[PDB]
Amino acid sequence: MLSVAARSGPFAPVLSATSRGVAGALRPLLQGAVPAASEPPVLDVKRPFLCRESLSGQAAARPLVATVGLNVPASVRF
Amino acid sequence: SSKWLDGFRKWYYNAAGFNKLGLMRDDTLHETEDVKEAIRRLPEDLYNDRMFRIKRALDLTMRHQILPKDQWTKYEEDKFYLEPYLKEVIRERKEREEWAKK
Amino acid sequence: QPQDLEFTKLPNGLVIASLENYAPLSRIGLFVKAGSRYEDSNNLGTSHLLRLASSLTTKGASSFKITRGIEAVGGKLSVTATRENMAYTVEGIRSDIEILMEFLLNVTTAPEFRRWEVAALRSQLKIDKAVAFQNSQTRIIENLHDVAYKNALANPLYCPDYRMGKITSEELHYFVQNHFTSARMALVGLGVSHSVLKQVAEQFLNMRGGLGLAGAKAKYRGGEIREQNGDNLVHAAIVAESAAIGNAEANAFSVLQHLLGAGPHIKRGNNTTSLLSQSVAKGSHQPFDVSAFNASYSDSGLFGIYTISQAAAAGEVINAAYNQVKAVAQGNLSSADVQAAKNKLKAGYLMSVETSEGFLSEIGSQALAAGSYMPPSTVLQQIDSVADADVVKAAKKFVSGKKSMAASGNLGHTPFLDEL
Amino acid sequence: AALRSQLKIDKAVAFQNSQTRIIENLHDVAYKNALANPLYCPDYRMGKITSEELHYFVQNHFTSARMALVGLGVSHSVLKQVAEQFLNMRGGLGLAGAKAKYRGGEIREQNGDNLVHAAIVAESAAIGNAEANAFSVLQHLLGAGPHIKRGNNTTSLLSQSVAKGSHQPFDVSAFNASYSDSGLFGIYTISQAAAAGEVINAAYNQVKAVAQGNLSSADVQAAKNKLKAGYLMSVETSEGFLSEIGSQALAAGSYMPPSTVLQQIDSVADADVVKAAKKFVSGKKSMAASGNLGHTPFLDEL
Amino acid sequence: SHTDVKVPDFSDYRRAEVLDSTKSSKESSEAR
Amino acid sequence: LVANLLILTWIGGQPVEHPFIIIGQLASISYFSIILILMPISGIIEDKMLKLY
Amino acid sequence: ATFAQALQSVPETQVSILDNGLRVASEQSSHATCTVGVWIDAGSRYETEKNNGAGYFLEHLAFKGTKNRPGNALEKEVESIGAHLNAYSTREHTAYLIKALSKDLPKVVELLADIVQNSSLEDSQIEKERDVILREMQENDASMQNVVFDYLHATAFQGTPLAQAVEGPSENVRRLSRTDLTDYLNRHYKAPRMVLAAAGGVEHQQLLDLAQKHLSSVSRVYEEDAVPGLTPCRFTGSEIRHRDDALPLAHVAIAVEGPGWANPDNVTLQVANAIIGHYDCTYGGGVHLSSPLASVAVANKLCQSFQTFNISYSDTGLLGAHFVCDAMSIDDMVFFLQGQWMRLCTSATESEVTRGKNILRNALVSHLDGTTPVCEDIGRSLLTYGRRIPLAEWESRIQEVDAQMLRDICSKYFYDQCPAVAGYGPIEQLPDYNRIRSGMFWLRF
Amino acid sequence: MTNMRKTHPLFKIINHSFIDLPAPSNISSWWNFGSLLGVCLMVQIITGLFLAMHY
Amino acid sequence: MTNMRKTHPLFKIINHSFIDLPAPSNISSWWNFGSLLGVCLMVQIITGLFLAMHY
Amino acid sequence: LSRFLGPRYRELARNWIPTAGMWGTVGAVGLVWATDWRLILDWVPYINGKFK
Numbered sequence A: 001m002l003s004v005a006a007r008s009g010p011f012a013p014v015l016s017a018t019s020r021g022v023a024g025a026l027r028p029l030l031q032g033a034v035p036a037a038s039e040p041p042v043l044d045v046k047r048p049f050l051c052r053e054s055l056s057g058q059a060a061a062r063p064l065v066a067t068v069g070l071n072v073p074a075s076v077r078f
Numbered sequence B: 001s002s003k004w005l006d007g008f009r010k011w012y013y014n015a016a017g018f019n020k021l022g023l024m025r026d027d028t029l030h031e032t033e034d035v036k037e038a039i040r041r042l043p044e045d046l047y048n049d050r051m052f053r054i055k056r057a058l059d060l061t062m063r064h065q066i067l068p069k070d071q072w073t074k075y076e077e078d079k080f081y082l083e084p085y086l087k088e089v090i091r092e093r094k095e096r097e098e099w100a101k102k
Numbered sequence C: 001q002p003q004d005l006e007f008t009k010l011p012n013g014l015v016i017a018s019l020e021n022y023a024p025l026s027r028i029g030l031f032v033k034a035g036s037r038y039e040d041s042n043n044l045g046t047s048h049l050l051r052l053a054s055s056l057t058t059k060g061a062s063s064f065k066i067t068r069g070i071e072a073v074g075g076k077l078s079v080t081a082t083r084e085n086m087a088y089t090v091e092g093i094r095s096d097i098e099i100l101m102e103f104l105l106n107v108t109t110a111p112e113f114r115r116w117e118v119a120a121l122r123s124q125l126k127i128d129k130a131v132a133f134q135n136s137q138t139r140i141i142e143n144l145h146d147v148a149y150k151n152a153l154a155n156p157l158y159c160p161d162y163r164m165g166k167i168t169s170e171e172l173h174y175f176v177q178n179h180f181t182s183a184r185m186a187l188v189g190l191g192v193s194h195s196v197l198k199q200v201a202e203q204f205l206n207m208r209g210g211l212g213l214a215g216a217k218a219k220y221r222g223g224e225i226r227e228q229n230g231d232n233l234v235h236a237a238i239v240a241e242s243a244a245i246g247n248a249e250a251n252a253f254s255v256l257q258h259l260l261g262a263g264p265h266i267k268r269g270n271n272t273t274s275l276l277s278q279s280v281a282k283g284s285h286q287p288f289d290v291s292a293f294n295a296s297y298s299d300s301g302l303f304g305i306y307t308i309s310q311a312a313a314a315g316e317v318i319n320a321a322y323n324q325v326k327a328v329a330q331g332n333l334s335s336a337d338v339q340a341a342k343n344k345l346k347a348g349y350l351m352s353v354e355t356s357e358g359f360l361s362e363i364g365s366q367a368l369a370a371g372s373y374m375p376p377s378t379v380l381q382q383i384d385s386v387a388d389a390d391v392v393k394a395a396k397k398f399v400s401g402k403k404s405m406a407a408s409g410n411l412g413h414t415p416f417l418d419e420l
Numbered sequence D: 001a002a003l004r005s006q007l008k009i010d011k012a013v014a015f016q017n018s019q020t021r022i023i024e025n026l027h028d029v030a031y032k033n034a035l036a037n038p039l040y041c042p043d044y045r046m047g048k049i050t051s052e053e054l055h056y057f058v059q060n061h062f063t064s065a066r067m068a069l070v071g072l073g074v075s076h077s078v079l080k081q082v083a084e085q086f087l088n089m090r091g092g093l094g095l096a097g098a099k100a101k102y103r104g105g106e107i108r109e110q111n112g113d114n115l116v117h118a119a120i121v122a123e124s125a126a127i128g129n130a131e132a133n134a135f136s137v138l139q140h141l142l143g144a145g146p147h148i149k150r151g152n153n154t155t156s157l158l159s160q161s162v163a164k165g166s167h168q169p170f171d172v173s174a175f176n177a178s179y180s181d182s183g184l185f186g187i188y189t190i191s192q193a194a195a196a197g198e199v200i201n202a203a204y205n206q207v208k209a210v211a212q213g214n215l216s217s218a219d220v221q222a223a224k225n226k227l228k229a230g231y232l233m234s235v236e237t238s239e240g241f242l243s244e245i246g247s248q249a250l251a252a253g254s255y256m257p258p259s260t261v262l263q264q265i266d267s268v269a270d271a272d273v274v275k276a277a278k279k280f281v282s283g284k285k286s287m288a289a290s291g292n293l294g295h296t297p298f299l300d301e302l
Numbered sequence E: 001s002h003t004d005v006k007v008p009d010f011s012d013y014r015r016a017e018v019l020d021s022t023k024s025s026k027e028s029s030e031a032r
Numbered sequence F: 001l002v003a004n005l006l007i008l009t010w011i012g013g014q015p016v017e018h019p020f021i022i023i024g025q026l027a028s029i030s031y032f033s034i035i036l037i038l039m040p041i042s043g044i045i046e047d048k049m050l051k052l053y
Numbered sequence G: 001a002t003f004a005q006a007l008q009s010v011p012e013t014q015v016s017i018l019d020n021g022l023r024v025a026s027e028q029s030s031h032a033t034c035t036v037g038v039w040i041d042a043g044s045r046y047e048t049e050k051n052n053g054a055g056y057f058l059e060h061l062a063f064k065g066t067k068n069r070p071g072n073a074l075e076k077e078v079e080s081i082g083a084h085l086n087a088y089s090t091r092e093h094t095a096y097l098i099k100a101l102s103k104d105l106p107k108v109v110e111l112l113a114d115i116v117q118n119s120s121l122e123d124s125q126i127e128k129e130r131d132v133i134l135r136e137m138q139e140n141d142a143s144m145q146n147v148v149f150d151y152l153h154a155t156a157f158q159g160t161p162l163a164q165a166v167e168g169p170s171e172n173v174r175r176l177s178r179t180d181l182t183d184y185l186n187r188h189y190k191a192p193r194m195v196l197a198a199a200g201g202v203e204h205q206q207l208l209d210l211a212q213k214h215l216s217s218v219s220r221v222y223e224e225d226a227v228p229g230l231t232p233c234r235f236t237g238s239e240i241r242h243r244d245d246a247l248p249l250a251h252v253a254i255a256v257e258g259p260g261w262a263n264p265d266n267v268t269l270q271v272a273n274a275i276i277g278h279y280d281c282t283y284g285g286g287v288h289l290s291s292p293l294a295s296v297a298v299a300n301k302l303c304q305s306f307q308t309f310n311i312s313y314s315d316t317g318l319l320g321a322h323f324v325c326d327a328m329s330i331d332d333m334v335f336f337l338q339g340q341w342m343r344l345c346t347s348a349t350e351s352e353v354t355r356g357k358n359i360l361r362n363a364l365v366s367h368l369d370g371t372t373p374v375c376e377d378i379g380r381s382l383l384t385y386g387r388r389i390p391l392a393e394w395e396s397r398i399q400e401v402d403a404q405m406l407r408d409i410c411s412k413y414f415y416d417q418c419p420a421v422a423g424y425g426p427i428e429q430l431p432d433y434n435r436i437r438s439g440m441f442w443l444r445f
Numbered sequence H, I: 001m002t003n004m005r006k007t008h009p010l011f012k013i014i015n016h017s018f019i020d021l022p023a024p025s026n027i028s029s030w031w032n033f034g035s036l037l038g039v040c041l042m043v044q045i046i047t048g049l050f051l052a053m054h055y
Numbered sequence J: 001l002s003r004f005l006g007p008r009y010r011e012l013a014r015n016w017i018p019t020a021g022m023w024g025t026v027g028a029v030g031l032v033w034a035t036d037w038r039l040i041l042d043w044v045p046y047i048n049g050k051f052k
């Protein structure tokens, strides 16, 4: 009884991930399907930070505040 | 014997003309299904170098010119980057054909 | 003539077992200690991609050859992975078990791992993770392991979304060459001859013979994480540190799990002997599903309560279950209840063993863990030898230990650890 | 229904940088309710927010007793005239809230980023306290950010203590955020994956030294001067002046002049700064971390 | 529920060999 | 091949006497043999020359 | 050992008949556990549109209290001995089975007798299980494959007792009363339509003695001399569509009339169904799958899943496929599935036949591995065959199946036949019945 | 294997225009007159081709 | 407003075939002969129409 | 070339021999019916009457 299936009764298919690399002779129960998950929007790539002088100033020291506007860009201040 | 064959291959490589446009043999290979699969199996750097060489050759033959004499791809430095990918693609294809045969 | 297990220790570290029962189907399993616990922060999801990479090109068989040959003989190849272990199982007729076993040995020992193949396989990895996370129970369990452990067993069984597309053939080869060594491998078989399995193991298991990279010991951190997702059916797992597997305390924890309820024995039932179900149903008329969760890996174990309840009644359901376990820890239990729990545990163990897949998994897991086979009557003897005072001690250890909660749903009324 | 897609896009643009995510996670693990609510819409709640819920929120919180109509370059007669012409027909105080109980804890989002962000905070005072003023002075003493472009930050004690034993890019600062009934004070560190533990430990030991009493009155006076300059530069812009006027009107219901604000800032004592540092050291901890956390320590390791 | 979905009676349009439900088909499918 | 097409045009222009018959016969035979036989064999020759296989 | 001598070394089962006609069948194996169940030939084909939910509602009420053990004493006894108590209902058969140890067989047989012949139906328990079954109908129509299977059954057997589902409609659920349940119980729980099947670690003589002790004299008498008869069901080539575009995926099942249980062509149709096959998005085979439909689905990203099914009833059944695909590839999957069907009808080859034979052998033996599945096989086989078909006989039939006779049976059951179509979800891409029939035949044979 | 009707470009055009064209199910007998006009145009073209062959 | 050249159907067909067609940048004068053949066909259509007009 | 030379393709061809021969028979009878081929239609007894 040195195994997850022989110890956890209903938690065996939860603790054990089974992958059929080759399709079996018998059909499997609960085949499942991906219901067309959405894609996050494509945005501009934020710059990386490689030197400490340009790294300074980006550690937050104030409460988070958001700002939207009719004709001004939505900014966030830290 | 084979040294004369190497020299004659050198002369034919000069006479073919794709060294004048900065191209290689695998660059000048016509893209069939196996060739496209090999190009897709190529790594990123070799893909970029091949595609830039093709673009430069197209620009040169649009201008109806060639590269300068010191800029031609020499026969010694003409590396065959697509040979193992093409060989393994043809090997897999022939295994598939034999399995469909039997 | 149903023979016993022929069991031997091939001197490069390999464990070889075989039972020839003349079954019409033969089944070969190869069990490695290459679970997700042996990864660190730089190669997360490598175990997931290796599990899904069982049908790729190998050094001796192409992917097309493997798939078409196994389907042409009709057999099947499967990979079952838990946080400590990975089992490659092949299933087929006795007349073809030579080439099925050869294919499995190729896949496990000599993988090519071409970069374009894993680049194609990353999309199937995303699909597999989505299909697995369709149900919220496994999401709660990975969240629970992540919040409970620090380094080793906190690594998820599925690849993270940032690692999705960053796993490479270099990391796959590193993982295989560092953990697929013959000292951590057990090649077991049902319906096959011990002589032929030994000679194929000696013939094509002589290229990797180290001990392997020893993983980090798992450390306990405790704490809570919550997933507000707006489902009216709130899931909540509250666990604590327990003993490692293969211990008398582990046996006591399994007995305690079957005493508190480890699933239903009657479909559409009320779970009348489950103390947790009785305690919850004595206070809440809403639908619920409460059970005892036990998960013991080779380093350490987690024991606790798993509750599925309504959004409004989640607090009272969790409090009732926790008070029931507190009463069990204080010693409000009966010897008849303990005997019924032992009967449930031994019956469930025997029904797990009786199928050939479960028998294979038990043989391989025992071979990896203890290095020798334990016959079922001695497991019956140990389960009977569990005492009720050990159950009281295990429940007291659970209630006094530091806790880990993983919750999900609509958490307007789900309590925290300070209120439990 | 057409605007919830704009909600998704705006949340993505807000989470383009990781400090927003770190602060949201920090509040979420610091409070049980009323401040753990995310400032941006959850991904599941996208597609679920109804016009009925919006009308309920407006009718319960957009009421006359909790609003202030302030104006710069406008007549008070016109302002009060439009006040009784529009804002006269709302109910009263409305719903109160949930008092924002503290919980503590930690979460760690491993996302494989090239730098590790880590915020370790504890409870502090609320807006309108000498303890809160001392906490703000302590924030400016430990370093609220750079005053010099591409500088070394030679006066900020956190940056000095980290740069004493580091050879990697880093950014350490004192995070302070007070509210109506509770506050959050702690350290924010951005570092490399390998040096994150060293940076966090150095910053925590610097704040522990401040709590023990390793400080000078000249440094406290410099911190007070920094706070005065920052407050006055916040006031000097008409946008910031209007924001401060509205915030003061909502909070206290009266005007506190900048001279009196600077008077109480000068009235902050250094013993209260030591008391605030000791309170942060002894308080229960809330940690939000993200990055590659193979060497980022845990709260029990601090 | 989905079980309440019942096919209505089509007996106004059925062929002469199909009108009864107690007699199986495939003895008349060839003829039709 | 283009030269042979020009030969065939001129042969179709001229009438049936010596040696137009044998010139046209050789031209047609060379045309068919080139366009069916000589181009693929020469292509194989160039592939072996540039070491394609 | 070879396959033939291994299958002949698989032990045979023992079947005996009591005085009342109740059949008792057992298979002794080396396991320490056993599965003992009662299989009853009662279901929706027997229900007559007024008691349509009676069998499933009795399935609900079977474990909720008996005459000897009121309330939950039966549940307490089963949980105390550590057994797993299960039941299922299908349009032909109702099964009540217990998985337990080999030492608790008399208790299991006594509990099974108390469940079957001594069911007690309280009015309050009927009301509680009515609430439970209504909630289960809600949770079942929240699913999608069961909806399509029910729709396929309705549209394929419309006007017959085979069309109605196991659960029954909500109006029959709300109008079911205790008298009608007792009428169903006293009409459909006779001795000749019950088999007590025990598999695993059981002794046949001990099981027979326990059957003569407990299962003796169950009813033996209809009390009206009115034995029901199962009339043949008319297969209706037809189409049901349930368009609802808020669902993310579309489920389509296309079937034809089956061969029946007693038809020897069932093995051949299972070979063809193994050749076509099944697939879901978690398979690691990729484009290298031997199944052409699955390979094309992987290559062109057509479907999330498909499967071939062969459901058999008394001289009838449904033989076909069911697939889950997006809203824009239903036409493609119908075209490719029909092409695969006509390929098997016209130009099936011996390599595919050998592959399908091996797959069917492996699936059959793997399904006949395990005490509970072999008990299920024994009960169902004694219900619908009059005997248990040995695995050696199954292997002999599979070996008798070759390419030409596969093509003959496939042309008999698929070529130019009117199908039953059941669509659910965004099924605009699903073609009309005329187009489906035009795909069901070929213009080049 | 692929769908030639939906893949081959001429066959794709014919499929999207005349074969798998989404048409309303309730159009009366008056909607056949477009096809009648096309058929009469083809008849006129062929018939006049023969007439001018002999004209 | 919209882009008429790529939204009007005849206009978008003409744009996708002749205006915004991705053509190789290096094709020589030998690639002009297809358009030369088309303009030959148009010229012969017009001139022969006049010849059959007076023939 | 060598792609269509194997036992599976041979047995596919042998399965399609009767259908190809039947289609050739259809083509032949349609050709003689459309062209009114005298050499074939002076043998069937009924259609012999119209030619006289």
Ligand code: HEM
Pocket: H041, H044, H045, H046, H047, H048, H049, H051, H052, H055
């Ligand atoms: C390619 C297409 C056509 C060709 C080649 C063609 C050719 C001819 C010719 C040669 C004649 C004179 C022969 C005769 O009248 O005896 C004729 C007559 C005529 N054509 Fe056409 N035609 C074509 C299409 C049409 C169309 C489309 C229409 C009408 C919509 C049409 C209407 C007529 C009429 C009304 C006559 C006179 C018949 C009469 O006087 O009784 N034709 N055509």
Ligand code: HEM
Pocket: I041, I044, I045, I046, I047, I048, I049, I051, I052, I055
């Ligand atoms: C709508 C299109 C066309 C029409 C109406 C047309 C009409 C005519 C007419 C009426 C003539 C007689 C006048 C003459 O012989 O000089 C003629 C001659 C001729 N046509 Fe066309 N034609 C058309 C297109 C073409 C095309 C496409 C070609 C070549 C591919 C062609 C090649 C010729 C030639 C070679 C002559 C002989 C002229 C000569 O030898 O003097 N025509 N055509």
